[PDB]
Design an enzyme around this catalytic site. Structure first.
Site, PDB file in Angstrom:
ATOM      1  N   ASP A   1       0.831  -1.200   0.000  1.00  0.00           N
ATOM      2  CA  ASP A   1       0.000   0.000   0.000  1.00  0.00           C
ATOM      3  C   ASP A   1       0.870   1.257   0.000  1.00  0.00           C
ATOM      4  OD1 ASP A   1      -2.746   1.346   0.345  1.00  0.00           O
ATOM      5  OD2 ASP A   1      -1.681   2.078   2.121  1.00  0.00           O
ATOM      6  N   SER A   2       0.304   2.364  -0.471  1.00  0.00           N
ATOM      7  CA  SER A   2       1.013   3.635  -0.525  1.00  0.00           C
ATOM      8  C   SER A   2       1.426   4.120   0.863  1.00  0.00           C
ATOM      9  CB  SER A   2       0.152   4.700  -1.210  1.00  0.00           C
ATOM     10  OG  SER A   2      -1.039   4.939  -0.479  1.00  0.00           O
TER      11      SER A   2
ATOM     12  N   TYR B   1      -0.638   8.772  -2.836  1.00  0.00           N
ATOM     13  CA  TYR B   1      -0.480   8.565  -4.273  1.00  0.00           C
ATOM     14  C   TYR B   1      -1.677   9.157  -4.995  1.00  0.00           C
ATOM     15  CZ  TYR B   1       3.215   4.997  -3.686  1.00  0.00           C
ATOM     16  OH  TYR B   1       4.378   4.313  -3.405  1.00  0.00           O
ATOM     17  N   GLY B   2      -2.789   9.242  -4.271  1.00  0.00           N
ATOM     18  CA  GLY B   2      -4.074   9.598  -4.837  1.00  0.00           C
ATOM     19  C   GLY B   2      -4.170  10.932  -5.550  1.00  0.00           C
TER      20      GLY B   2
ATOM     21  N   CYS C   1      -3.660  -0.936  -2.328  1.00  0.00           N
ATOM     22  CA  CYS C   1      -3.969   0.440  -2.735  1.00  0.00           C
ATOM     23  C   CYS C   1      -4.813   0.525  -4.016  1.00  0.00           C
ATOM     24  CB  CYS C   1      -2.657   1.218  -2.909  1.00  0.00           C
ATOM     25  SG  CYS C   1      -2.804   2.931  -3.469  1.00  0.00           S
ATOM     26  N   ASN C   2      -5.965   1.190  -3.927  1.00  0.00           N
ATOM     27  CA  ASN C   2      -6.840   1.368  -5.088  1.00  0.00           C
ATOM     28  C   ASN C   2      -6.202   2.219  -6.189  1.00  0.00           C
ATOM     29  OD1 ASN C   2      -8.553   1.157  -2.454  1.00  0.00           O
ATOM     30  ND2 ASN C   2      -9.892   0.342  -4.063  1.00  0.00           N
ATOM     31  N   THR C   3      -5.531   3.295  -5.788  1.00  0.00           N
ATOM     32  CA  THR C   3      -4.835   4.163  -6.729  1.00  0.00           C
ATOM     33  C   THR C   3      -3.790   3.381  -7.524  1.00  0.00           C
ATOM     34  OG1 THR C   3      -5.185   6.222  -5.494  1.00  0.00           O
ATOM     35  CG2 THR C   3      -3.278   6.123  -6.953  1.00  0.00           C
TER      36      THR C   3
ATOM     37  N   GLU D   1      -6.454   9.818   8.371  1.00  0.00           N
ATOM     38  CA  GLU D   1      -5.118   9.725   8.960  1.00  0.00           C
ATOM     39  C   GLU D   1      -4.936  10.585  10.213  1.00  0.00           C
ATOM     40  OE1 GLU D   1      -2.702   8.310   4.943  1.00  0.00           O
ATOM     41  OE2 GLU D   1      -1.706   9.257   6.653  1.00  0.00           O
TER      42      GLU D   1
ATOM     43  N   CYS E   1     -11.121   3.040  -1.848  1.00  0.00           N
ATOM     44  CA  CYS E   1      -9.952   3.671  -1.255  1.00  0.00           C
ATOM     45  C   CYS E   1      -9.703   2.990   0.080  1.00  0.00           C
ATOM     46  CB  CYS E   1     -10.166   5.178  -1.058  1.00  0.00           C
ATOM     47  SG  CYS E   1      -8.784   6.022  -0.233  1.00  0.00           S
ATOM     48  N   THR E   2      -8.443   2.639   0.331  1.00  0.00           N
ATOM     49  CA  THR E   2      -8.067   1.873   1.515  1.00  0.00           C
ATOM     50  C   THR E   2      -8.497   2.532   2.824  1.00  0.00           C
ATOM     51  OG1 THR E   2      -5.865   2.921   1.546  1.00  0.00           O
ATOM     52  CG2 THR E   2      -6.067   0.802   0.413  1.00  0.00           C
ATOM     53  N   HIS E   3      -8.597   3.858   2.811  1.00  0.00           N
ATOM     54  CA  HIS E   3      -8.882   4.627   4.019  1.00  0.00           C
ATOM     55  C   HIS E   3     -10.362   4.644   4.383  1.00  0.00           C
ATOM     56  CE1 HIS E   3      -4.817   5.895   3.314  1.00  0.00           C
ATOM     57  NE2 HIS E   3      -4.824   6.690   4.369  1.00  0.00           N
TER      58      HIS E   3
HETATM   59  N1  DGL Z   1      -3.995   3.970  -0.537  1.00  0.00           N
HETATM   60  C1  DGL Z   1      -4.686   4.945  -1.373  1.00  0.00           C
HETATM   61  C2  DGL Z   1      -5.174   6.117  -0.525  1.00  0.00           C
HETATM   62  C3  DGL Z   1      -4.048   6.956   0.033  1.00  0.00           C
HETATM   63  C4  DGL Z   1      -3.182   7.530  -1.062  1.00  0.00           C
HETATM   64  O1  DGL Z   1      -3.634   8.489  -1.732  1.00  0.00           O
HETATM   65  O2  DGL Z   1      -2.060   7.012  -1.262  1.00  0.00           O
HETATM   66  C5  DGL Z   1      -5.857   4.314  -2.115  1.00  0.00           C
HETATM   67  O3  DGL Z   1      -6.376   3.272  -1.712  1.00  0.00           O
HETATM   68  O4  DGL Z   1      -6.315   4.846  -3.128  1.00  0.00           O
END
Ligand code: DGL
Ligand code: CA
Ligand code: CL
Length: 250
Positions: free
Chosen positions: A7-8, A39-40, A70-72, A150, A180-182
């Site tokens: 993950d990012s 990363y988003g 990570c979705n991004t 966060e 999105c993971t968050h």
């Molecule tokens: N992990 C990213 C969210 C946080 C980021 O922007 O890196 C996602 O799932 O898209």
């Protein structure tokens, strides 16, 4: 079965928790690129480049499979990651779409995808849903959710304003994809905002079912041995990980 989870940063712990509690693996290596998160809000080229560096990092572990939590990163880097890796690499986007189809099982139902700017812009969710005949879609970047999560803001007036800012005069979906993971951290507030008619699609739970249908995995008797690595302040990641997954039990 030793796998990797990328993950990012810290958000991928939502996906890890799913894989952890599902008891699919003997061992899991979690790597967060905490030095460069998020990363988003960054560009495709940068995202792909950072993901390939992550794959480089995992080379030292002898993993059987890599999950891109990570979705991004799932949105842009799967092609490159698979061209280089010699073990199966899975993202969470495909899994997220099929869990949505399984939840709704009706192409006429309304779908809302919420994610980072980069994930939305990739149109990867939109593309998969449309191809399956799901045309009543809306896709929406809700980027401030990430730094709010966060900072530990999972409810309250501050978060309410955030949702009203993003969700003003948009229709209530039969399903929203927490792409999105968050976002599972905001699950209750989101669900309260939309009401019970809206099913929440969780990326971590989604990738779990996805793996179970695709692979022949015996359910483990014991919890996986977790390993945490990060490009910065690994103790902070571990601290968060301890809280979110509750690695302090028996
Ligand atoms: N992990 C990213 C969210 C946080 C980021 O922007 O890196 C996602 O799932 O898209
Ligand atoms: Ca390959
Ligand atoms: Cl991709």
């Amino acid at each position: 079965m030793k796998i990797g989870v990328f993950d990012s940063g810290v958000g991928g712990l939502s996906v890890l928790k799913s894989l952890y509690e599902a008891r699919l693996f003997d061992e899991i290596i979690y790597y967060g690129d905490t030095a460069r998160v998020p990363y988003g809000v960054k560009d495709k080229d940068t995202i792909i480049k950072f993901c390939l560096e992550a794959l480089d990092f995992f080379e030292q572990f002898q993993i059987d499979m890599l999950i891109i939590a990570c979705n991004t990163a799932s949105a842009y880097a799967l092609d490159a990651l698979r061209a280089k890796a010699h073990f199966p690499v899975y993202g969470v986007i495909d899994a997220g779409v099929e869990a949505t189809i399984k939840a709704l099982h009706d192409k006429n139902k309304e779908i809302l995808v919420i994610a980072t700017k980069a994930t939305i812009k990739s149109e990867e969710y939109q593309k998969r849903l449309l191809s399956q005949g799901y045309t009543n879609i809306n896709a929406l970047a809700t980027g401030l959710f990430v730094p709010m999560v966060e900072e530990g803001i999972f409810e309250g007036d501050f978060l309410q304003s955030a949702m009203e800012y993003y969700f003003k005069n948009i229709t209530t979906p039969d399903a929203l994809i927490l792409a999105c993971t968050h976002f599972p951290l905001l699950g209750r507030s989101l669900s309260k905002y939309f009401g019970d008619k809206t099913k929440l699609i969780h990326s971590g739970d989604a990738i779990v079912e996805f793996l179970k249908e695709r692979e022949n995995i015996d359910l483990k008797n014991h919890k996986a041995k977790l390993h945490f690595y990060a490009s910065s302040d690994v103790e902070s990641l571990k601290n968060t990980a301890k809280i979110w997954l509750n690695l302090l039990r028996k």
